[PDB]
Curated annotation (Swiss-Prot):
It is found in: Virion membrane; Host apical cell membrane. This is Matrix protein 2. The lineage of its organism: Viruses, Riboviria, Orthornavirae, Negarnaviricota, Polyploviricotina. Forms a proton-selective ion channel that is necessary for the efficient release of the viral genome during virus entry. After attaching to the cell surface, the virion enters the cell by endocytosis. Acidification of the endosome triggers M2 ion channel activity. The record marks 20 as: Seems to be involved in pH gating. It comes from Influenza A virus (strain A/Udorn/307/1972 H3N2). The gene is M.
Amino acid sequence: SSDPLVVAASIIGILHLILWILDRL
């Protein structure tokens, strides 16, 4: 639904950002 999709997308973006920061370090 509209509430679960936006939450899922947000978690995905956060995980990608964390991975990128770990690679830069």
